[PDB]
């Protein structure tokens with residue numbers, strides 16, 4: 001199995017935001033994500049909300065299995081902008 005890098009704007013910003021806040025890259029868009037504390041989840045959510053210009057919550061971040069899933073939420077906002 002091989003890591004899949006981010007494919008579009010939504011995946012790149014989501015992947016990068018996760019890595020920046022936690023200090024560790026998710027590896028790829030399908031990799032299982034490590035568990036976060038609520039502060040890291042809130043920061044990721046705030047940053048994604050600002051960039052996507054739509055509401056992304058700490059719960060959205062916490063319930064995402066991988067970056068692809070979280071980026072899907074971000075993508076819905078980018079295409080509606």
Ligand SMILES: [Zn+2]
Nearest residue numbers: 002003027028
């Ligand atoms: Zn890897």
Ligand SMILES: [Zn+2]
Nearest residue numbers: 068069071072
């Ligand atoms: Zn998808």
